[PDB]
Design a protein around this ligand. Structure first.
Ligand SMILES: *[C@@H]1O[C@H](CO)[C@@H](O[C@@H]2O[C@H](CO)[C@@H](O[C@@H]3O[C@H](CO[C@@H]4O[C@H](CO)[C@@H](O)[C@H](O)[C@@H]4O)[C@@H](O)[C@H](O[C@H]4O[C@H](CO)[C@@H](O)[C@H](O)[C@@H]4O)[C@@H]3O)[C@H](O)[C@H]2NC(C)=O)[C@H](O)[C@H]1NC(C)=O
Ligand SMILES: *[C@@H]1O[C@H](CO)[C@@H](O[C@@H]2O[C@H](CO)[C@@H](O[C@@H]3O[C@H](CO)[C@@H](O)[C@H](O)[C@@H]3O)[C@H](O)[C@H]2NC(C)=O)[C@H](O)[C@H]1NC(C)=O
Ligand SMILES: *[C@@H]1O[C@H](CO[C@@H]2O[C@@H](C)[C@@H](O)[C@@H](O)[C@@H]2O)[C@@H](O[C@@H]2O[C@H](CO)[C@@H](O)[C@H](O)[C@H]2NC(C)=O)[C@H](O)[C@H]1NC(C)=O
Ligand SMILES: *[C@@H]1O[C@H](CO)[C@@H](O[C@@H]2O[C@H](CO)[C@@H](O)[C@H](O)[C@H]2NC(C)=O)[C@H](O)[C@H]1NC(C)=O
Ligand SMILES: *[C@@H]1O[C@H](CO)[C@@H](O[C@@H]2O[C@H](CO)[C@@H](O)[C@H](O)[C@H]2NC(C)=O)[C@H](O)[C@H]1NC(C)=O
Ligand SMILES: *[C@@H]1O[C@H](CO)[C@@H](O[C@@H]2O[C@H](CO)[C@@H](O)[C@H](O)[C@H]2NC(C)=O)[C@H](O)[C@H]1NC(C)=O
Ligand SMILES: *[C@@H]1O[C@H](CO)[C@@H](O[C@@H]2O[C@H](CO)[C@@H](O)[C@H](O)[C@H]2NC(C)=O)[C@H](O)[C@H]1NC(C)=O
Ligand SMILES: *[C@@H]1O[C@H](CO)[C@@H](O[C@@H]2O[C@H](CO)[C@@H](O)[C@H](O)[C@H]2NC(C)=O)[C@H](O)[C@H]1NC(C)=O
Ligand SMILES: *[C@@H]1O[C@H](CO)[C@@H](O[C@H]2O[C@H](CO)[C@@H](O)[C@H](O)[C@H]2NC(C)=O)[C@H](O)[C@H]1NC(C)=O
Ligand SMILES: *[C@@H]1O[C@H](CO)[C@@H](O)[C@H](O)[C@H]1NC(C)=O
Ligand SMILES: OC[C@H]1O[C@H](O)[C@H](O)[C@@H](O)[C@@H]1O
Ligand SMILES: OC[C@H]1O[C@H](O)[C@H](O)[C@@H](O)[C@@H]1O
Length: 671
């Protein structure tokens, strides 16, 4: 309806305005007039807004700009005129706007720049002239814009770069020269040396090719260039001559992504000894040779996601990676090889990578069915900490498969098709292991020695793996004294022994939802009820949802003094014994939704309700009498505990007089 002012910032966006407001407070610093129907900006209308530092008039229909406007606003730093109809500029236009740091002129249908319109902009940092119809980089006839750091000229009609067109930047230090989506066909000799210092050049979506890229790099020789981006530039092949001009530079970043790059010739990057970050993702490399990556001894990061050619099904055009292809990268720490069709891991695939700490091989192979005692031999001399092996259709893990990985901390084997018995010999050599993910696999059968060789383990995830023999004596988890997180959810488990978690005093998170443990907590269970939560003094989060519980023994939560969150929703509970929650002095969240609860009495819920933050007891068949709900309604009226959907989803069932009536509106005066 009108403008909203908050902390001297006026938001007048999307209000269909044809005139500039005259009733706004005289102390505003920022004025946002975006997405309106303004045709002009007269000086007289801005006389009362002399404190402005920022003016955003983007997405309007302004064609002329009055020079006197900048004299009325002496503190103006940011001016945004994007998406307007300001096609013609003159020397008078920005002549009085001396304190500007940012000037945005995108999508204004500017086709020609005459004379010197930016000569008075001595403090300008960013100039954005993108999405116009310019056919040249010439913006003046004399040395100006000395403090400029960013020049954006993307999506224009520039066909050639000359030195006498960029010579006005002779005293400038450009961190960014954005020339993307311009169909440049010639780089005239000396064109980049016309700028004082050039640090970054962007030529994405520019059809260059091998021959023109070679000429471009010759023009970059002896410049200050650190970053070069040539993404989607149709670089089909590379040779030992393509980047030769870059020998006379200290380039640290190169991006060659999305180029449909098929052949990478020997010694292609021998001229880049200072390169640190290399992006090669989304290409079509058919065969990587042993000398393709020669000379890249300083690279710390390499992205090879979807870099190799796809499977042809018929022609058998599978990608090939020669042995020793990574031996040159002595400083490589992070390697991403995700989503490829590589056949397997050869004996010398990763040899020479003496500084590798992170390696992701997620969905990297066609099928890596079996992990043998030799599969990872080439990583023996790498200080590898993280290994991701998801989505590879792995079926079997044999003995001593990870013996070469003595420094490994995180091992992700989730989302595969593993179906075997875990003997325990699979984990030999993993002396520094912190976490193992084994979730979403075919089947895993445990024994008493399954995790004996890894007593350092702190986190174990075994979700949806059709887990068998967890009821072994002694427990498969017994040697894991330092365990903090255990996920045994979605396994349809029916039997567990008393001592399953004995000695695990440091356990903090236990997930047991979607199993069949109901019988174990019924009083008539042969041998008595199973007290599997005994001694878990540091337990903070416990999930017991969807187990079909209809009985809870009085002493099961006895030792849980530190418990903060308990989830017992989606069960069939009604009658709960007195003092079942008596030792829960740290409870902050209680969930008992979609159960069969009729009575909510003090002798049960009193200690649990004391200092709660959240409560969820929605969708229960509440009994609306005095002996069943009086205390609960009295608690609801005076508590600060957040109870979501209280008015709508907390209804009475029995007696038929109160059927469908909210429990919040009950009368306690009769009790
Ligand atoms: C091994 O390598 C694989 C492959 O790279 C990694 O897999 C990625 O794992 C992460 C984490 O599990 C995945 O991200 C999660 O994606 C979920 C997808 O659902 C999205 O929902 C939103 C709407 O909310 C939509 O906008 C999206 O389009 C998706 O449909 C997403 O639900 C989830 O959100 C999480 O947000 C925060 C985390 O910031 C959590 O607190 C919250 O609970 C919630 O779970 C994640 O973003 C990712 O999709 C996986 N990538 C692929 C391609 O599979 C493994 O993680 C790697 N292993 C390790 C240990 O690093
Ligand atoms: C870039 O790679 C090319 C390979 O395609 C290199 O060119 C090849 O250079 C070798 C010498 O190092 C040439 O071999 C020599 O040929 C002469 C004449 O026949 C012979 O007398 C020598 O005994 C030797 O065999 C080879 O012919 C040549 N290949 C070509 C271009 O035909 C080139 O040197 C590399 N450039 C650099 C140094 O980056
Ligand atoms: C089990 O853990 C103890 C204690 O580890 C410390 O606390 C953890 C929560 C985590 O923060 C670790 O980084 C801490 O070191 C380990 O005992 C320590 O062992 C190391 C090496 O021998 C050494 O610092 C001390 O001897 C111990 N320090 C303490 C806290 O007593 C123990 O080694 C772990 N069990 C394993 C890995 O088998
Ligand atoms: C700047 O403010 C002036 C008011 O001083 C606006 O001019 C008036 O515009 C209305 C509506 O078009 C006319 O009815 C008046 O005759 C104009 N002058 C008078 C007497 O106030 C002007 O439109 C404003 N500029 C914009 C477009 O923001
Ligand atoms: C910015 O303008 C606002 C609005 O005029 C000023 O806030 C007013 O401050 C006086 C105190 O002298 C109050 O009596 C008014 O009620 C305030 N107006 C409202 C409703 O916001 C503010 O002082 C000016 N400068 C700032 C932000 O310090
Ligand atoms: C690449 O970086 C090196 C520095 O490691 C630059 O060489 C130095 O340049 C400064 C200033 O010109 C001299 O004072 C040093 O003596 C040079 N160090 C030596 C001996 O190499 C080199 O100029 C940079 N390359 C480019 C083209 O800028
Ligand atoms: C040159 O390119 C590098 C790319 O490595 C830029 O540095 C990254 O900048 C992004 C900003 O989005 C950060 O998220 C990364 O963490 C940076 N990488 C690292 C580790 O430095 C850099 O900004 C570019 N320009 C410069 C400073 O030369
Ligand atoms: C890239 O250079 C390597 C040199 O390391 C070439 O590999 C040689 O291939 C021939 C047969 O084609 C063998 O006889 C040599 O033994 C190989 N060299 C060694 C010692 O590895 C490779 O052919 C070149 N790739 C191409 C074809 O461009
Ligand atoms: C937990 O919740 C209780 C119940 O509201 C808090 O009650 C005590 O502190 C209140 C605020 O300081 C006092 O107004 C109450 O009188 C007092 N209750 C009594 C008599 O014990 C309690 O502070 C919360 N946290 C604590 C300290 O356990
Ligand atoms: C550019 O820098 C040179 C060297 O410091 C200086 O002599 C010259 O005056 C500068 N150009 C101008 C006028 O900005
Ligand atoms: O979603 C978090 C985790 O879920 C499973 O454990 C996956 O195997 C793992 O890769 C993922 O990071
Ligand atoms: O199972 C025998 C005993 O196990 C635990 O100590 C229970 O807290 C206790 O009530 C029970 O009698």
């Amino acid at each position: 309806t009108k403008c909203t002012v908050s902390h001297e910032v006026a938001d007048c966006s999307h209000l269909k305005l044809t005139q500039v407001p005259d009733d706004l407070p005289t102390n505003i610093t920022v004025l946002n007039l975006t997405h309106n129907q303004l045709r002009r900006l007269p000086a007289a209308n801005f006389t009362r807004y002399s404190q402005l530092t920022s003016l955003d008039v983007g997405f309007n229909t302004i064609s002329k700009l009055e020079p006197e406007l900048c004299q009325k606003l002496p503190m103006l730093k940011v001016l945004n005129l994007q998406h307007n109809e300001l096609s013609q500029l003159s020397d008078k236009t920005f002549a009085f706007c001396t304190n500007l740091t940012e000037l945005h002129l995108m999508s204004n249908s500017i086709q020609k720049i005459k004379n010197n319109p930016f000569v008075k902009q001595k403090n300008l940092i960013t100039l954005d002239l993108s999405h116009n119809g310019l056919s040249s980089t010439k913006l003046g006839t004399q040395v100006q814009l000395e403090n400029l750091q960013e020049l954006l000229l993307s999506n224009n009609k520039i066909q050639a770069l000359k030195s006498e067109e960029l010579d006005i930047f002779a005293n400038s230090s450009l961190k960014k020269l954005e020339l993307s989506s311009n169909q440049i066909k010639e780089f005239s000799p000396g064109c980049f040396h016309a700028i004082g210092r050039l640090f970054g050049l962007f030529l994405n979506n520019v059809q260059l090719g091998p021959s023109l890229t070679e000429k471009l790099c010759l023009e970059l020789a002896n410049t200050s260039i650190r970053n070069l981006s040539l993404s989607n530039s149709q670089l089909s092949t590379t040779s030992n001559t393509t980047f030769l001009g870059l020998k006379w530079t200290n380039l640290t970043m190169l991006d060659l992504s999305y180029n449909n790059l098929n052949v990478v010739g020997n010694d292609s990057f021998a001229w880049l000894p200072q390169l640190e970050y290399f992006f090669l993702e989304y290409n079509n490399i058919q065969h990587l040779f042993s000398h393709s990556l020669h000379g890249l001894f300083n690279v710390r990061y390499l992205n090879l996601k979807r870099s190799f050619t796809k499977q042809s099904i018929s022609l058998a055009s599978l990608p090939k990676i020669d042995d020793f292809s990574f031996q040159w990268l002595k400083c490589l720490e992070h390697l991403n090889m995700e989503d490829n069709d590589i056949p397997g891991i050869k004996s010398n695939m990763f040899t020479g990578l003496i500084n590798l700490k992170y390696l992701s091989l997620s969905n990297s192979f066609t099928s890596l069915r079996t992990l043998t005692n030799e599969t990872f031999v080439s990583l023996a001399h790498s200080p590898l900490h993280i290994l991701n092996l998801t989505k590879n259709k792995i079926s079997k893990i044999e003995s001593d498969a990870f013996s070469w990985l003595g420094h490994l901390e995180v091992l992700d084997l989730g989302l595969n098709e593993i179906g075997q018995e875990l003997t325990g010999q699979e984990w030999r050599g993993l002396e520094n292991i912190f976490e193992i993910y084994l979730s979403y696999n075919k089947y895993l059968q445990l024994t008493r020695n399954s995790f004996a060789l890894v007593p350092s383990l702190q986190r174990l995830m075994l979700r949806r793996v059709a887990l068998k023999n967890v009821d072994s004596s002694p427990s498969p988890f017994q040697p894991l004294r330092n365990l903090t997180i255990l996920d045994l959810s979605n396994n349809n488990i029916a039997n567990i022994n008393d001592d399953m978690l004995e000695g695990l005093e440091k356990l903090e998170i236990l997930d047991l939802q979607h199993n069949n443990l109901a019988r174990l907590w019924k009083h008539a269970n042969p041998g008595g009820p199973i007290y599997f939560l005994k001694g878990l003094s540091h337990l903070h989060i416990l999930n017991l949802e969807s187990n079909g519980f209809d009985e809870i023994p009085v002493e099961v939560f006895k030792d849980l003094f530190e418990l903060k969150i308990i989830d017992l929703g989606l069960n069939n509970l009604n009658t709960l014994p007195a003092s079942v929650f008596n030792n829960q002095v740290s409870l902050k969240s209680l969930n008992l939704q979609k159960n069969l609860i009729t009575s909510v009495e003090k002798k049960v819920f009193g200690p649990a309700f004391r200092n709660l933050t959240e409560l969820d007891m929605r969708f229960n068949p509440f009994d609306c009498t005095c002996e069943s709900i009086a205390w609960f309604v009295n608690w609801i009226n005076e508590t600060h505990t957040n109870i979501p959907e209280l008015s709508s989803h907390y209804l009475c069932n029995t007696p038929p007089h109160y059927h469908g009536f909210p429990v919040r509106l009950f009368d306690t005066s009769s009790c």
